[PDB]
Amino acid sequence: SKVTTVVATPGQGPDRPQEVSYTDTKVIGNGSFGVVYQAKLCDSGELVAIKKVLQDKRFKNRELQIMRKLDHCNIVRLRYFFYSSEKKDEVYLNLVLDYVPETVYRVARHYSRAKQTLPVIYVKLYMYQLFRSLAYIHSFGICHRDIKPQNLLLDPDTAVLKLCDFGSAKQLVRGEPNVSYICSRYYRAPELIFGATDYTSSIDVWSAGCVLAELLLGQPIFPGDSGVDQLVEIIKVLGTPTREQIREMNPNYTFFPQIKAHPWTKVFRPRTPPEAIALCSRLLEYTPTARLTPLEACAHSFFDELRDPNVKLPNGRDTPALFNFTTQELSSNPPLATILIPPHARIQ
Amino acid sequence: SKVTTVVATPGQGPDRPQEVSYTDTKVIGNGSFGVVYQAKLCDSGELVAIKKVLQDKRFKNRELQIMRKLDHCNIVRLRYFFYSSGEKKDEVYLNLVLDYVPETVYRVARHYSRAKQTLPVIYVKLYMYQLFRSLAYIHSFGICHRDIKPQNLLLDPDTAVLKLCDFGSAKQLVRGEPNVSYICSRYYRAPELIFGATDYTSSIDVWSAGCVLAELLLGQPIFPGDSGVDQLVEIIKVLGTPTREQIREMNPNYTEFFPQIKAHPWTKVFRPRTPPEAIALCSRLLEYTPTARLTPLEACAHSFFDELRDPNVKLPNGRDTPALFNFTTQELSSNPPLATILIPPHARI
Q: Do residue B180 and residue A255 have CB atoms under 8 angstroms apart?
């Protein structure tokens, strides 16, 4: 019906302002993040999400900066941003971004409502693309600081997963301190609950750990209404941290209920693939530097089936691009290439 | 059913174990707070709640220690405790025989919310007051609950009595000593907690209490959010941005790092027929500055609670109001001249 038309700056690429018209402007969601719209680009008829948020004239926008720095097959792409005008006499920043139909959250709640669970394949596929996105933003030393099921968008038909909502990501700098009160309750890592401030990008690795667990498990692995509740669940599985391990998370704790390290194998449903639990235990480690790196985790047995050249989706379609590893991603440790890129994908 | 006979040490009193015999052990609930059963005492036929938790010898049970010091109309009474071996083999459980109370403020408030109804201010008034007595009392011992939330406020719908409960997070707060910043349920955390400060004080509880107040008026949590950021926003939306002092006064070293949202007026927040009184009290508990917050006793003496100091105040069900005025010195320790307000003309003669 009514068609809107703006002048916007393209996301990556040089300020060459463009006319952008769109229509069919359903609200998707809204809250802390901002307000998110579905929208249909006039031209192509393509669907896009638009994230309208408040802009402080004082500062430049942190998410925006990041987003423009970022181009990756598993991260929603900013396409245009642009300013505009709920709250009169003040200015809105609008990110026009890829739109994706489902979210890992929705999807796993669907399976859970139905007491069933996710074909393991569909997990691997997702977990892997997630580790790719982490591997890649981490190579700018950027940290999402909010990996949760709700922030992982799925294309159900193509199985493409895209990491999204960077309203929270920050480029971590060594010896600079950052707020410990980020990240979503359940996916907070030990050191965060222990209120640390010198945490590294490896908190993303812990969150992903809980995402994997939660998909394997039907339900969040470290639930808790309070920090303590969570710690107990974490302890009940890892076992009591040690003085050594606690110095690792947060020194200023060098205040503890003495429990034995419960065998992982008894935490997961019975026919849970062994390789998967192996993965988990190497992601969810008390010691931040002991956890796998995103890239080390991509290159792990649990993902071995993704490298089989025969691998297809249940709907018999092809798996998305899995091995097109820009030098950038590989940057954190390039010898891993040999594994990440299976013989059959180095063929002429 | 089965009858069970342990030998148990009385909660207060001397330290003299005795045979205690109970039966009918339905299982109220269980989470981090260990298990909580319910059961009927053979002697009094009375109902109790047993809280069974795991015990190390590697330390005295902090909760037990506290419970034994506590006698108030508005705090669950520890009646006995005793040890046993239960679910874990060669593992040792401490059991806490405690007053059983039929309802919780969570449960009630939900009914009302579902129903789209809103809890009659008389009840918000009674519950809140009683809450505030129980804090006043515990804080006089410099004990701090550290987990004030509707789930942990029990009620007897009938007698209208609120009793504060669950003390596994309660710790006595000593000055210049540090305490873990990861106590308190999601929605009810004081800002300084969200900033991981460890220099916090009993006030964390007054914030958690003003949260319960707000909820009972609003009909839902006042500062919701699945992350510390989301809540901190929610709060800023209401209290405006912290000054730099306000900030240095919670956690000192978050001086750097904030959106400059103006304060959306307190009035502007509540349904329009909300008693001014209520909001005024709210604004006084939900302060950034820990020191600027009302004290529990200071709060009972607030104009909001005036309806209760009336002589012909009576419950909706027609019964009269519970012990509101049995203040002991102890309780009033923080500020005695309040007594002339807290205790009205008619009470206690």
A: yes
CB nearest A225 (choices: B181, B185, B234): B185
Distance between CA A61 and CA A56 in Å, rounded? 8
Around Cβ A258, how many Cβ atoms within 10 Å? 10
Helix B203-218 / helix B276-285 crossing angle, nearest 10 deg: 150
Which of B103, B95, B86, B84 minimizes the C-alpha distance to B37? B95
Amino acid at A108: A
* Joined tokens for residue B38: 């319910």
Topology, domain A102-318: Transferase(Phosphotransferase); domain 1 (1.10.510)
Beta strands in B91-199 (DSSP E): 93-99, 103-104, 143-144, 153-156, 161-164, 171-172
Record the tokens describing residue A119, joined without a space.
């074909």
Residue B81 has which token pair? 């405790």
Angle in degrees, 0-180, between the axes of helices B203-218 and B121-140, rounded to the nearest 10 = 170
CATH class of A19-101: alpha beta
User: Please, what is the end-to-end C-alpha distance for chain B in angstroms?
Assistant: 46
Residue A255: beta bridge partners?
none
Q: Is A295 helix (H, G, I), strand (E, B) or coil?
A: helix
DSSP code per residue over A87-141: -TTS-EEEEEEE--SEEHHHHHHHHHHTT----HHHHHHHHHHHHHHHHHHHTTT
Resolution value in angstroms:
3.1
Query: What is the domain class of B103-349 according to CATH?
Result: mainly alpha
Distance from CA of B285 to the nearest CA of A (A): 21
Query: Is B318 marked as binding a ligand?
Result: no
Q: Which of B56, B62, B182 to mutate to test the interface with A (most CBs of A within 10 A)?
A: B182
Dihedral pair phi/psi, residue A222, rounded to 5°: -130, 55
AA letter at A93: L
**Experimental approach taken:** X-ray
For an interface test with A, the pick among B230, B231, B253, B258 (most A C-beta atoms closer than 10 Å) comes out as: B230
CB pairs under 8 A between A and B: 81
Q: Where are the domains of chain B?
A: 6-102, 103-349
